[PDB]
Structure formats: structure tokens, C-alpha cells
Amino acid sequence: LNPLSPDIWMYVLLACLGVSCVLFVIARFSPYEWYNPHPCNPDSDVVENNFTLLNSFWFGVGALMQQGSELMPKALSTRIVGGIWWFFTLIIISSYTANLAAFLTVERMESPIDSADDLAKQTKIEYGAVEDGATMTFFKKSKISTYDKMWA
Amino acid sequence: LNPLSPDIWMYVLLACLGVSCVLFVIARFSPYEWYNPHPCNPDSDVVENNFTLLNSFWFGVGALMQQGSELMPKALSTRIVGGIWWFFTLIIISSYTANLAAFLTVERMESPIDSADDLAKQTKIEYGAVEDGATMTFFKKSKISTYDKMWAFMSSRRQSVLVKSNEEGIQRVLTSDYAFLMESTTIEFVTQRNCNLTQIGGLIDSKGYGVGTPMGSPYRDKITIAILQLQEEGKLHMMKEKWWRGNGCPEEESKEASALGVQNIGGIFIVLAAGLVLSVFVAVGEFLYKSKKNA
Amino acid sequence: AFLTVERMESPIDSADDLAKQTKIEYGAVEDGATMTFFKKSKISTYDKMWA
Amino acid sequence: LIDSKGYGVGTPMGSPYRDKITIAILQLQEEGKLHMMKEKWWRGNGCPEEE
Amino acid sequence: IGVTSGIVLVLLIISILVQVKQPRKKVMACKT
Ligand SMILES: CCCCCCCC/C=C/CCCCCCCC(=O)O[C@@H](COC(=O)CCCCCCCCCCCCCCC)COP(=O)([O-])OCC[N+](C)(C)C
Ligand SMILES: CCCCCCCC/C=C\CCCCCCCC(=O)O[C@@H](COC(=O)CCCCCCCCCCCCCCC)COP(=O)([O-])OCC[N+](C)(C)C
Ligand SMILES: CCCCCCCC/C=C\CCCCCCCC(=O)O[C@@H](COC(=O)CCCCCCCCCCCCCCC)COP(=O)([O-])OCC[N+](C)(C)C
Ligand SMILES: CCCCCCCC/C=C\CCCCCCCC(=O)O[C@@H](COC(=O)CCCCCCCCCCCCCCC)COP(=O)([O-])OCC[N+](C)(C)C
Ligand SMILES: CCCCCCCC/C=C\CCCCCCCC(=O)O[C@@H](COC(=O)CCCCCCCCCCCCCCC)COP(=O)([O-])OCC[N+](C)(C)C
Ligand SMILES: *[C@@H]1O[C@H](CO)[C@@H](O[C@@H]2O[C@H](CO)[C@@H](O[C@@H]3O[C@H](CO)[C@@H](O)[C@H](O[C@@H]4O[C@H](CO)[C@@H](O)[C@H](O)[C@@H]4O)[C@@H]3O)[C@H](O)[C@H]2NC(C)=O)[C@H](O)[C@H]1NC(C)=O
Ligand SMILES: *[C@@H]1O[C@H](CO)[C@@H](O[C@@H]2O[C@H](CO)[C@@H](O)[C@H](O)[C@H]2NC(C)=O)[C@H](O)[C@H]1NC(C)=O
């Protein structure tokens, strides 16, 4: 859960219940989603919708998880909802994959400090020596190009 | 929208309306897409296509967003359209994911300004100089085609972009938005001992220091020979890299990618909300157009 | 991996960035004032550039 | 700039014209003539490259 | 966080309000 901020994991799930409720209302408000599920025999007042509230979450979660569902809306007011929630979905998964491919290569590029030269550049990790000892006396006396910087 | 150029975001959307119009025409021109949607009872001249213009955009957008649709063409002339638009789609998403996985692992940042000429056009970034100093006296005296324009700014906004001292000018770049102009041997002292500042541009004027002597002193020629001896042996580069060395700042701290918040993405939530508001206007637009047919 | 090795690379920007390159080779006018400097120099990198 | 040299109007050993040219060069250097001269001859053909 | 949790919880009750009240089987071909 690290490649996305906890603000974003809530805002996706709040939009997942959000667009699911809008797509349910906007399909009942639209006349084009009302049709017959019985195309074999002719009309006998069998005009029927397909969007339950249970199906609208199944379109919300089912499109978020890149799998798809069986609804596939057919009104222009509902396809714009599906056309935006799909474009919402790609730029989450392709941002989750790209950021997780940035966490795993930064903690693979890193190497621990392995020498005095690798410690000659660090300022987070600070040096140390026994004061007025034989160890501190060396760096005070030294002239070789790095140990002066370590004495600096 | 950064991992793809704005040329490419237009060329995808122009091809999204382009292939959608071609797949609509090429399905009506083909005989194989004409069949019966009623396979239970036999034929009663019920030969019917499936591709509307509304469905062809829904196949164009529906395949671009890696989700798929319900059309699934069945003529060889239409499947070659679907077979290429699918291969068009993978090398966009796998190029968008791969480039966004290159922006988030390698930050290569650039300052807006690079010279005085690039600063000669900026009005958001304001200049600065020590008032009644040797730096301000140059731009008052200058005539070279840009520095007069740089003095046209500072003479207008006096007591706004004319600082009182060097210490205030450092504390104004560090806090506010400011582009302070000063000597080049102090900038190489401040930047080495304050790791969040930088030097943009090059040497504008060309001054020089020097061991002062009285008027007609014998020591002028003997120091000039002595300075040139030290300058070629390398002592005046050993001295300058002893005192302008500073604390030795860091130049590599690529952190872990500092997880995507609302500041990075969140314009996606704007175009999410803009799509749902637009869908309501289409809904009430088609609620009345159907009743107008019924009226 | 192709698009980030393109971003991790930097062009050479100094003598210190040229002090490590072996693909890009140096050059100087022989018996000139430029070559005479690196023969005479002692500052920690230019000796390596003279090496 | 790696080294730091400098040009100069040469005079004989103990010439009277050394002090009068030094005052004259510093006068031209502050009025801006030695930036008008250098941007007249090192201006070149005015390349386009930027891209 | 709070306004968006208020807007969605409004729309969550309205969606249940449509689900219960609409007969949705063969009735109201053009309504709601
Ligand atoms: C149906 C409609 C289709 C339309 C085609 C697609 C649309 C074409 C694209 C159009 C826009 C891109 C080009 C315009 C560039 C102008 C720049 C600009 O002002 O952008 C502004 C935002 O921009 C938006 O808010 C965009 C919102 C449009 C929503 C599109 C939904 C329709 C998709 C339906 C899906 C079809 C479903 C299937 C259908 C069968 C900038 O924002 P700002 O606030 O200024 O922030 C800057 C602040 N700053 C300056 C301090 C830094
Ligand atoms: C109908 C129902 C819908 C539900 C949706 C809810 C969405 C989610 C909303 C909120 C998620 C809740 C946040 C978790 C907070 C608890 C923190 C915790 O203690 O960790 C717990 C994790 O265990 C879990 O919490 C896993 C629960 C998964 C969510 C439920 C399934 C979603 C179904 C969706 C189906 C779609 C329906 C499709 C409809 C067509 C246990 O941790 P621990 O091991 O005991 O402690 C060890 C600590 N240590 C590891 C740090 C050392
Ligand atoms: C990988 C996924 C697969 C590909 C999907 C491609 C699909 C189309 C995708 C994008 C097409 C839109 C044109 C984008 C051109 C770039 C504009 C820009 O630079 O920023 C703009 C953002 O402001 C906006 O315009 C917001 C628009 C976001 C995309 C909305 C498309 C509708 C959904 C599509 C659904 C139907 C598709 C259409 C068919 C009907 C301007 O704002 P700014 O802040 O002022 O910019 C300055 C910041 N900068 C300096 C750094 C730049
Ligand atoms: C029918 C639908 C109605 C709405 C119900 C939603 C349904 C559920 C879907 C999503 C709900 C959950 C996610 C929230 C969606 C976006 C809000 C958000 O968090 O973004 C920003 C807050 O935005 C602001 O409130 C302040 C700035 C306003 C920008 C434009 C508002 C237009 C919103 C649409 C109005 C119509 C648009 C035009 C129509 C043609 C977060 O930004 P920030 O953290 O504050 O820091 C950056 C500040 N900055 C932005 C200044 C740089
Ligand atoms: C203020 C500014 C905001 C914008 C103003 C709008 C905001 C709202 C204001 C007012 C409402 C206006 C909304 C438009 C009409 C919607 C109603 C409708 O579609 O029904 C009909 C209108 O038939 C037509 O006139 C043709 C248009 C629809 C087909 C084209 C879809 C492809 C769009 C590509 C998208 C990208 C286009 C290119 C983008 C660059 C279509 O009918 P049908 O279902 O197809 O066939 C069945 C009919 N039958 C049963 C009798 C046989
Ligand atoms: C990332 O880069 C940003 C670009 O500059 C930078 O943004 C600026 O940050 C500074 C502080 O870090 C902002 O200064 C603030 O200015 C407001 C103005 O109302 C002040 O309230 C306050 O300045 C105060 O000034 C006092 C002296 O008068 C001083 O004693 C106080 O301590 C206090 O500093 C703020 O500091 C400045 O506005 C920002 N520029 C903008 C928004 O354009 C970010 O800091 C930088 N971030 C990091 C982590 O480096
Ligand atoms: C350069 O300036 C930045 C911005 O002020 C400093 O970074 C942080 O500054 C805030 C001040 O609001 C401190 O609270 C943080 O602790 C600083 N982050 C650190 C120290 O990691 C930055 O420290 C400055 N660089 C210096 C002083 O060398």
C-alpha cells in the first residue's frame, strides 16, 4: 500500500462508491436503458432495466480491478460515466505500477557505506574518534586527500 | 499527463475518432457483418447489423481503456481494424507506464532561468542588488542592450528590489522569490556553505583583486613576480579550495519516490467530477429528446 | 529500463566527470602551454589527467 | 575555466607607458568598450542551434 | 474528506431510495 498515499486510497474507495451510486441513478433517469430482455418473441410490456444497486457496485469494482463485468451500458448518459471511470482506472493502475517500480529500484540502487570514501560524502552519518587519542592524532596529522576532509 | 508529449495526446485522440469512423464504414461496406440477431426461429428477412456510430466510438474508447466492449467484430475486414487498434493500444499503455516509471525514479529538475537574458524577460522573478554598492553602480552605468533593461526594472521598483545589505539579500532568496545579484566570490562561498542555494548564469563583469601598494612603491614588481609564481605552482588553487571548500554539500539524494499524493495526481479527480456533471447534462438532454419524439 | 538508463546518465560536465571516462579520451597540443600545465600540475585530478 | 591566465600590452623593462596604458585599459573596461569589442569579433555568425 | 463523505452518503441513500421504490420488473418504462 506504500506507492499511493493514504489520502489516495480513501479517495479511490470514496469515488468507487460515488460513481457506483451516480451510474445507478443516471441509468434509471435515462430512457434508453429501458428495453426488453426477451428479443425472441415480440413485446408484451416486458420493458426491463438491468442496473440494480448490486450490479452498479459490481460495475464499479469490476472495472476498477481491470476485469470488466457483464453490464456494458448502452445509453449515451451511462457510457460517459463508463468512459470516464475507465480513464480514471488506467491512471491509477499505471500510477501504482510505476511508483512501485520506483520504490523497488531506489532500494536496489542503494549501497551501504563500505569505506572512508563512501563515508567522506555522508552528512547524515557522522564520524567519531577518541579525543586526544592515537586515532584522532592520525587525522590531525594526515594529508591524504580524504582524511583532511574527514578532519574538516 | 507528463509522460506523453502533448503532440501524442492529440494524436491518440485524433486516431481514436479516426479508427472509430473507419471501423463504422468498413463494417457497412462488408457483407459478412450482416446477419440475423434471432437465431432461435428461422429467417424472416431479419438480417441486421450491430455497428452504430455510437457503438463504434464505444469500441474505440472501450478498447483504448483496456476494458473491451460487447461488439467483437466477425468479418475479416473488421477484425484487422480491431487487430491493429489493439496493438496500437498496448504500446501506448506500456509506454505510459514505463515512462511514468522513469519520471518517478529519476528526478531531473531545471531552474526557470539560466542567464541574465533569460532573466531579462521574467516578471514573476524579480531582480535585486545592494543599494549604493558596486553591483548597483554597474547597471546604472551600463549601456549594453540588456543591463539597461535590467536597470529599467530596478530604477522603477526602488525600495522593492533594492536590498540594504548582502545578508538581507541571502535571506530573501532563501525565503521569497528573488534573483539577487552580487559578487562572484561570495556566491561561491554561500552556495558551498548553504546547500539549498545555487548559482545560475556566468560572470557578467570582470573585476580583479590585488595587493595594494603606495603610489610608486618598490614592492609592486616584486609581488607581481611572486603572485605569478604562486599562481602557476598551484598554491592559489590550493588556498581557494581550502576556504571556499565549505562543508562539502551533497549531490546525490534520490529518495524513495515519496508516494503519490493529491499534489501529484488529483487532476484525475477533476476530470472524474467533470465527466459526471457532463453526463447529467446529456441525460436531461436525452430525457427531453425522447419525449419530444413521443410528443 | 531503457527509459530510466536514459535518465540516469549525465553528459560530462567537468574535468572531474572526465577524470573517470576511458571511452572519451583527452587531448592537448604537444609542447604547448596547455600540455605544460598538466605536466607541472599537482592538484589531485590533473595528475590523473596527465597519467 | 581550469587555469587563470591573462593577456596584456607588453612594454619594455621600465617603460613609461605601462602606467598610462593600465589607467587607459581600466577606463575602457568600465565604460564597456572591451565588451563591445569582444562581442564584435567573438560574435561569429550567430548560430541557431537551441532545440 | 468530510464534504466528499457527505456527498457520497447522500447519493448512497438516494440509490437505496430508487432501488426500493422502483418496481423495475416490467413497470415504468420511462420514469425516475
Ligand atoms: C462526450 C464528450 C467527448 C469529448 C472528447 C474528450 C475531451 C477532449 C479534451 C478537452 C480538454 C483538453 C484540451 C483543452 C486544453 C485547455 C487547458 C485547460 O484549460 O484545462 C484545464 C482543465 O481541463 C479540464 O478541466 C478538462 C475537463 C473536460 C472533461 C472531459 C469529459 C468528456 C469525455 C467523455 C468520454 C467519452 C465516453 C464515450 C462516448 C461514447 C486546466 O485546469 P486549471 O484549473 O486551469 O489548472 C491550471 C492552474 N495553474 C494554471 C495554476 C497551473
Ligand atoms: C458487502 C461488503 C463490502 C465491503 C467493502 C469494504 C472496502 C474496504 C474498506 C475498508 C477496509 C478496512 C480497513 C482495515 C482496518 C483494520 C486494520 C487491521 O487491524 O488490520 C487487519 C487487516 O484485516 C483486514 O482488515 C482485511 C479486511 C478487508 C476488507 C473487507 C473485504 C472487502 C470486500 C470487497 C467486495 C466487493 C463487493 C462487490 C459488490 C458487488 C488485521 O490486522 P492484524 O493481522 O490482526 O494485526 C497485525 C498488525 N501488523 C501486521 C501491523 C503487525
Ligand atoms: C495511458 C491511457 C491511454 C491513453 C488515453 C488517452 C485518452 C485522452 C487523454 C487525454 C486527452 C486530453 C488532451 C491532453 C493534452 C495535454 C494537455 C495538458 O498539458 O494539460 C492540461 C490538463 O488539463 C486538461 O485538459 C485535463 C484533461 C485530462 C484528460 C481528459 C480526457 C477525457 C477522458 C478521455 C476519454 C475518451 C477519450 C477521447 C475520445 C472521445 C492543461 O492543464 P495545465 O495545468 O494548464 O497544463 C500545464 C501543465 N504542464 C506544463 C506540465 C503541461
Ligand atoms: C455530479 C458530480 C458532482 C460532484 C460529486 C462528486 C462525485 C464523486 C467523485 C469524486 C468525489 C471524491 C473526490 C473529490 C473530487 C475532486 C475534489 C478534490 O479533492 O480535488 C481538490 C479539491 O478541490 C476543491 O474543492 C478546491 C479546488 C476546486 C477545483 C475545481 C473544482 C471543480 C469540482 C467539480 C465541479 C464541476 C466541474 C466543471 C463541470 C463542467 C484537491 O486539491 P487540494 O488537496 O485542495 O490541493 C490542491 C489545491 N489546488 C487544487 C488549488 C491546486
Ligand atoms: C453548453 C455546452 C456543453 C455541451 C452541450 C451539450 C450538453 C447538454 C445540452 C443539451 C443536450 C445535447 C446532447 C446531445 C444529444 C444527446 C441525445 C442523443 O444522443 O439522442 C439521439 C440524438 O441524435 C442525434 O442528434 C445525433 C447525436 C447522437 C449520435 C452521435 C454519438 C457519437 C458522439 C461521439 C462523442 C465525441 C464527439 C466528438 C468530440 C470531439 C441519438 O439517438 P440514438 O440513441 O443514437 O438512436 C436511437 C434513436 N431512435 C430510437 C429513434 C432510433
Ligand atoms: C520547495 O521550494 C519552494 C520554492 O521556493 C519553497 O517555497 C517557499 O518556501 C518559503 C519557506 O520555506 C516560503 O516563505 C514563507 O513566506 C510566508 C509569506 O507569508 C511567510 O509566512 C514565511 O516567511 C517567514 O519570514 C520570516 C521573516 O520575515 C521568518 O523569520 C519566518 O521564519 C518565516 O520564514 C514562510 O516561510 C515561500 O513563500 C515559498 N515560496 C513560494 C510559496 O512561492 C519551499 O520552501 C521548498 N521546500 C523545501 C522543503 O525546501
Ligand atoms: C534549505 O531550505 C529548506 C527549506 O527551508 C530546508 O529544508 C527543511 O526546512 C524546514 C523549514 O520549514 C525544516 O523544518 C526542515 O527540517 C528542513 N528539512 C530538512 C533539514 O531535512 C533545508 O534544510 C535547507 N538546507 C540547509 C539549511 O542546508
Tab-separated table of C-alpha atoms in Angstrom, chain B residues 54-269:
chain	number	residue	atom	x	y	z
B	54	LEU	CA	-22.426	5.258	-31.189
B	55	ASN	CA	-21.149	1.690	-30.855
B	56	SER	CA	-18.037	2.384	-32.937
B	57	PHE	CA	-16.851	5.083	-30.542
B	58	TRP	CA	-17.706	2.667	-27.738
B	59	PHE	CA	-15.405	0.136	-29.376
B	60	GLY	CA	-12.771	2.805	-29.915
B	61	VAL	CA	-12.789	4.117	-26.356
B	62	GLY	CA	-13.640	0.715	-24.896
B	63	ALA	CA	-10.560	-0.917	-26.384
B	64	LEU	CA	-8.306	2.068	-25.666
B	65	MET	CA	-9.071	1.871	-21.942
B	66	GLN	CA	-8.101	-1.857	-21.826
B	67	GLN	CA	-11.640	-2.891	-20.855
B	68	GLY	CA	-13.253	-4.188	-24.036
B	69	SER	CA	-16.804	-3.964	-25.326
B	70	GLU	CA	-19.679	-6.179	-26.434
B	71	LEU	CA	-19.318	-5.772	-30.207
B	72	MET	CA	-16.428	-8.192	-31.012
B	73	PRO	CA	-16.385	-7.922	-34.859
B	74	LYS	CA	-16.700	-11.037	-37.019
B	75	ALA	CA	-15.697	-10.020	-40.548
B	76	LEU	CA	-12.086	-10.343	-41.665
B	77	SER	CA	-12.049	-6.717	-42.815
B	78	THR	CA	-13.246	-5.557	-39.401
B	79	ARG	CA	-11.032	-7.852	-37.328
B	80	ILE	CA	-7.927	-6.397	-38.980
B	81	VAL	CA	-9.125	-2.997	-37.756
B	82	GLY	CA	-9.607	-4.458	-34.291
B	83	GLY	CA	-6.348	-6.363	-34.555
B	84	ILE	CA	-4.316	-3.221	-35.205
B	85	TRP	CA	-6.124	-0.878	-32.809
B	86	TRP	CA	-5.414	-3.402	-30.056
B	87	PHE	CA	-1.716	-3.421	-30.932
B	88	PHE	CA	-1.907	0.366	-31.040
B	89	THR	CA	-3.310	0.292	-27.517
B	90	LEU	CA	-0.681	-1.860	-25.786
B	91	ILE	CA	2.247	0.241	-26.959
B	92	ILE	CA	0.563	3.352	-25.574
B	93	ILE	CA	-0.278	1.997	-22.104
B	94	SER	CA	3.027	0.131	-21.825
B	95	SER	CA	4.770	3.318	-22.935
B	96	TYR	CA	2.781	5.427	-20.487
B	97	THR	CA	3.518	3.064	-17.599
B	98	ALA	CA	7.197	2.742	-18.498
B	99	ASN	CA	7.750	6.479	-18.879
B	100	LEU	CA	5.894	7.253	-15.643
B	101	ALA	CA	8.164	4.656	-14.042
B	102	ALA	CA	11.048	6.756	-15.341
B	103	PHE	CA	9.830	10.114	-14.036
B	104	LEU	CA	9.239	8.778	-10.536
B	105	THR	CA	12.650	7.134	-10.170
B	106	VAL	CA	14.870	9.851	-11.689
B	107	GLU	CA	14.174	13.488	-10.850
B	108	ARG	CA	15.971	15.783	-13.308
B	109	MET	CA	14.939	19.279	-12.270
B	110	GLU	CA	15.666	22.575	-14.016
B	111	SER	CA	15.545	26.203	-12.876
B	112	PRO	CA	13.425	28.628	-14.960
B	113	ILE	CA	16.364	30.978	-15.558
B	114	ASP	CA	19.844	30.293	-16.925
B	115	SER	CA	21.324	33.722	-17.710
B	116	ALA	CA	20.621	37.425	-17.452
B	117	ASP	CA	18.952	37.218	-20.872
B	118	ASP	CA	16.578	34.535	-19.598
B	119	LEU	CA	16.047	36.801	-16.591
B	120	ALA	CA	15.537	39.832	-18.863
B	121	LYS	CA	12.051	38.603	-19.774
B	122	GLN	CA	10.786	37.294	-16.425
B	123	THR	CA	8.470	39.498	-14.382
B	124	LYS	CA	7.429	36.848	-11.847
B	125	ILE	CA	11.059	36.501	-10.739
B	126	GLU	CA	12.294	39.922	-9.625
B	127	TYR	CA	15.887	41.196	-9.526
B	128	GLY	CA	17.902	42.579	-6.644
B	129	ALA	CA	21.083	44.440	-5.762
B	130	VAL	CA	22.835	46.103	-2.828
B	131	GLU	CA	21.774	49.748	-2.850
B	132	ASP	CA	24.661	52.206	-3.392
B	133	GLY	CA	27.018	49.282	-3.883
B	134	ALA	CA	29.468	48.295	-6.582
B	135	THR	CA	26.882	45.941	-8.085
B	136	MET	CA	24.122	48.542	-8.470
B	137	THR	CA	26.623	51.112	-9.776
B	138	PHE	CA	27.408	48.841	-12.734
B	139	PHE	CA	23.827	48.631	-14.029
B	140	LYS	CA	23.339	52.393	-13.624
B	141	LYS	CA	26.464	52.964	-15.723
B	142	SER	CA	25.961	50.115	-18.204
B	143	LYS	CA	24.768	50.544	-21.783
B	144	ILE	CA	24.847	47.007	-23.204
B	145	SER	CA	21.376	46.304	-24.544
B	146	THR	CA	20.070	44.155	-21.650
B	147	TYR	CA	21.519	45.615	-18.472
B	148	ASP	CA	19.740	48.884	-19.213
B	149	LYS	CA	16.539	46.822	-19.331
B	150	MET	CA	17.677	45.237	-16.068
B	151	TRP	CA	18.171	48.757	-14.722
B	152	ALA	CA	14.795	49.799	-16.142
B	153	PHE	CA	13.267	47.333	-13.688
B	154	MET	CA	15.288	48.235	-10.600
B	155	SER	CA	15.062	52.017	-11.026
B	156	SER	CA	11.271	51.733	-11.210
B	157	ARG	CA	10.750	49.428	-8.228
B	158	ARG	CA	13.129	51.172	-5.819
B	159	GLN	CA	12.896	50.044	-2.154
B	160	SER	CA	11.345	46.825	-3.501
B	161	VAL	CA	14.129	45.112	-5.460
B	162	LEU	CA	16.969	47.142	-3.960
B	163	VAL	CA	18.260	45.432	-0.830
B	164	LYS	CA	20.144	47.121	2.031
B	165	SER	CA	22.949	44.581	2.527
B	166	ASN	CA	24.314	41.190	1.458
B	167	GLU	CA	22.821	39.452	4.499
B	168	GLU	CA	19.281	40.564	3.664
B	169	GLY	CA	19.667	39.506	0.033
B	170	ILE	CA	20.619	35.973	1.043
B	171	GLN	CA	17.664	35.823	3.436
B	172	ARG	CA	15.308	36.959	0.671
B	173	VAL	CA	16.297	34.417	-1.988
B	174	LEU	CA	16.090	31.740	0.705
B	175	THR	CA	12.572	32.770	1.780
B	176	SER	CA	10.883	34.750	-1.006
B	177	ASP	CA	11.148	34.542	-4.806
B	178	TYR	CA	14.195	36.635	-5.630
B	179	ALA	CA	17.171	36.718	-8.004
B	180	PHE	CA	19.862	38.597	-6.083
B	181	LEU	CA	22.889	39.977	-7.970
B	182	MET	CA	26.215	40.125	-6.137
B	183	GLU	CA	29.941	39.386	-6.400
B	184	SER	CA	31.035	36.032	-7.782
B	185	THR	CA	33.428	35.142	-4.962
B	186	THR	CA	30.703	35.428	-2.346
B	187	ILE	CA	28.239	33.253	-4.286
B	188	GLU	CA	30.920	30.560	-4.398
B	189	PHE	CA	31.166	30.982	-0.624
B	190	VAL	CA	27.442	30.947	0.173
B	191	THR	CA	26.497	28.032	-2.110
B	192	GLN	CA	29.218	25.802	-0.648
B	193	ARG	CA	28.009	26.537	2.901
B	194	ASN	CA	24.252	26.625	2.232
B	195	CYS	CA	23.358	23.523	0.257
B	196	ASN	CA	19.908	24.674	-0.910
B	197	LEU	CA	21.109	27.671	-2.963
B	198	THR	CA	22.724	27.746	-6.393
B	199	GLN	CA	24.477	29.940	-8.944
B	200	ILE	CA	22.743	30.457	-12.268
B	201	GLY	CA	24.455	32.301	-15.093
B	202	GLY	CA	28.053	33.264	-15.666
B	203	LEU	CA	30.394	36.164	-14.985
B	204	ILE	CA	28.827	39.422	-16.165
B	205	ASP	CA	31.520	41.943	-15.180
B	206	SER	CA	35.244	41.169	-14.951
B	207	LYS	CA	36.908	42.719	-11.906
B	208	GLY	CA	40.072	41.680	-10.115
B	209	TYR	CA	41.595	41.909	-6.669
B	210	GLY	CA	45.168	42.860	-5.884
B	211	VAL	CA	47.785	43.620	-3.240
B	212	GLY	CA	47.627	47.399	-2.944
B	213	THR	CA	50.856	49.397	-2.731
B	214	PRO	CA	51.560	53.134	-2.321
B	215	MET	CA	51.967	55.313	-5.399
B	216	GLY	CA	55.378	54.400	-6.755
B	217	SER	CA	56.316	51.598	-4.378
B	218	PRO	CA	59.261	49.232	-4.950
B	219	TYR	CA	57.208	46.244	-3.795
B	220	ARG	CA	54.803	46.293	-6.762
B	221	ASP	CA	57.134	44.490	-9.158
B	222	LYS	CA	58.393	42.023	-6.549
B	223	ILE	CA	54.884	40.948	-5.530
B	224	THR	CA	53.702	40.688	-9.155
B	225	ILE	CA	56.541	38.253	-9.843
B	226	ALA	CA	55.676	36.499	-6.574
B	227	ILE	CA	51.942	36.160	-7.315
B	228	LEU	CA	52.606	34.758	-10.798
B	229	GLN	CA	54.976	32.219	-9.240
B	230	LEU	CA	52.305	31.072	-6.781
B	231	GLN	CA	49.616	31.033	-9.466
B	232	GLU	CA	51.476	28.574	-11.697
B	233	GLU	CA	52.700	26.218	-8.980
B	234	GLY	CA	49.085	25.850	-7.872
B	235	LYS	CA	49.098	27.488	-4.438
B	236	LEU	CA	46.301	29.938	-5.291
B	237	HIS	CA	44.150	26.957	-6.204
B	238	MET	CA	45.149	25.160	-3.002
B	239	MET	CA	44.216	28.248	-0.990
B	240	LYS	CA	40.868	28.872	-2.680
B	241	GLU	CA	39.860	25.222	-2.345
B	242	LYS	CA	40.724	25.380	1.356
B	243	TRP	CA	38.456	28.285	2.305
B	244	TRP	CA	35.766	28.166	-0.403
B	245	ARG	CA	35.597	24.378	0.038
B	246	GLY	CA	32.904	24.803	2.653
B	247	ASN	CA	31.200	21.936	4.428
B	248	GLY	CA	31.150	19.749	1.332
B	249	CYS	CA	27.437	19.572	0.387
B	250	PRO	CA	25.621	16.518	-1.067
B	251	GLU	CA	24.901	15.922	-4.721
B	252	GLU	CA	23.081	12.601	-4.676
B	253	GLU	CA	19.969	12.168	-2.530
B	254	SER	CA	17.467	10.390	-4.761
B	255	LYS	CA	14.969	9.334	-2.102
B	256	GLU	CA	12.311	6.657	-2.310
B	257	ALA	CA	9.756	8.152	-4.675
B	258	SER	CA	7.683	9.916	-1.951
B	259	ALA	CA	4.260	8.320	-2.603
B	260	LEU	CA	1.733	9.935	-4.961
B	261	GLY	CA	-0.491	12.277	-3.014
B	262	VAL	CA	-3.156	14.740	-4.069
B	263	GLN	CA	-0.430	17.079	-5.318
B	264	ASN	CA	0.915	14.627	-7.909
B	265	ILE	CA	-2.316	13.129	-9.236
B	266	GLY	CA	-5.662	14.685	-8.418
B	267	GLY	CA	-6.351	16.421	-11.660
B	268	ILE	CA	-7.710	12.968	-12.452
B	269	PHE	CA	-10.311	13.639	-9.745
